[PDB]
Amino acid sequence: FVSNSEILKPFEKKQEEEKKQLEEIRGNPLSIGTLEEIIDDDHAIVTSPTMPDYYVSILSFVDKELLEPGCSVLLHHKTMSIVGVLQDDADPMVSVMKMDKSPTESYSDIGGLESQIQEIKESVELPLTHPELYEEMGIKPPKGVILYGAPGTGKTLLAKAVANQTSATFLRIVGSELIQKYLGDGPRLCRQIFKVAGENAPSIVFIDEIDAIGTKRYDSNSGGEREIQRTMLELLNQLDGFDDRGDVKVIMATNKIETLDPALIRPGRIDRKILFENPDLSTKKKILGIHTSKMNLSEDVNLETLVTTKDDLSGADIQAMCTEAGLLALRERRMQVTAEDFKQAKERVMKNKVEENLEGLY
């Protein structure tokens, strides 16, 4: 390199000498402690399973931003004074958190639902890559979205396709394990998720099927079980009490959020309503027709034959009718499925999960 002659000459002379001064303050235990609090007089607090007792004073190489209250640091060999700092990476010791991956997703199988597909894209995907329109208008966009209905029918599969359309960091947090019989574990782990991840702007947290939290009835705090009502009280702090700049986004898709809803949603932090809709003749063709793009079957059978008369078969119902009819034809080692497997797969799906209330006329 060019500067290795001129500029490096009054450089390496002091670069090697300071390393010897490091060996004086380092040695090679490099004890890893924990810094509880920063003192303006440059003094620290040692932490270790051996119960250390030290007055150690904060040395150089660290600054006020690098030193953190309760993250590990490097210590001196004899005096045990603070020297360096530990670098955090990989998986933290907090609750389950995904890091990153790039999924392959688009709008294909959920085609025909575009009436409600372009609605969620306006409040989620658009206010991400184009951080504008809020300077001229001045209205804050909503935070998350709330979806209630039958998941996996293309309503929740819609959220799976939006996750890839963001082209950014996506987070998925489990909302089940909070219901543990222990009291007080709910509000703890939830706060540490959004606090540590606040550095990365994109989050878009998704949660599925919470049937527990939300017991209120006539009063705000009842004499019911404490494993439930207090766990929800943490979500009020995230959506109301302490609000971010629009980084964290919470999404919850459950069966019926009715009783659950107005303890959380608030008027205007999160505005979304999406319910499972019975597809019409046009929507059923786009759902079933696109699934057959890569599928091969008998050219003498029309895909719209069973579309005319059918009872509430969504994309989830078709996913099995394609697999059930596929495994029967694969037994003979053929890529095409006959017509008998089409009606045979529809019956067992309609006779199991699909049941009406036997309410006629009205």
């Binding site: 991956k101 782990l189 996913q319 394609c322 596929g326 495994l327």
Partner: protein, 294 residues
Amino acid sequence: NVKDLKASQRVCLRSDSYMLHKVLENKADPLVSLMMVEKVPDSTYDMVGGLTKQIKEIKEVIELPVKHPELFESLGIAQPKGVILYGPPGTGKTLLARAVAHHTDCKFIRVSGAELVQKYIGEGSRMVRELFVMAREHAPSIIFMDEIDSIGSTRVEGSGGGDSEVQRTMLELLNQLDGFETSKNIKIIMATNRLDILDPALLRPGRIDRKIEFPPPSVAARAEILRIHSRKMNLTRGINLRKVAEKMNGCSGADVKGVCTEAGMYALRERRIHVTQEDFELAVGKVMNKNQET
């Protein structure tokens, strides 16, 4: 040097200076705490019978998406998901599900359901992604949900507590390996006894394909274990597996192993090396007395 140092290796360190001298040994043999992962278990072909209709169903469940998953993308469909198997009590279903990993050229991972539930700071919440790392290390493996399964008569497998949280965890697991990873080499097989607390959110067309029912015990089903366990157990040639089974009742998979165990205790009184049909009738009524209780 630093290039030859592998992660997690036993080395030597000085006393006062703590300086690294030389590499002594390698990574320890025992892994984690309790490892129930077993490849090619003691059950290979015939251990628990009744596999006539069971092999035919499980063949299109595990083998196809694991061995050659490209057959599904060529046909145009996607991979299936976990299957639920239920049957009558007195079976050994837990031991029966362990033989699924034999013909499929994979491993078998067993996960404790009740031990997954944890108080204080939840460990099971992290144990989901901890076992996901173990599932990531070994692709040819089958993760099983235990302690929620049926080894016999079972009433309540889930409730408002942590018991039903094990089945609700599968909601985020099926979305992790598909809606996130978009690659799944591992099928998680469930188990149960009766149908009571299963919600419509857990049972979906393509999350759970079919719930397999096991055949009830009968005259031919009482000789199930008698045609297998009799190999390692000493008997005589006057032992008719079908005729002696006609004198028994309510014993197919699990209890026949217990009746054959009680037959060994009766031979200890006579102190002989054989067990005849006379010692079988003593174990027919004694085992049924414990089942009729409660």
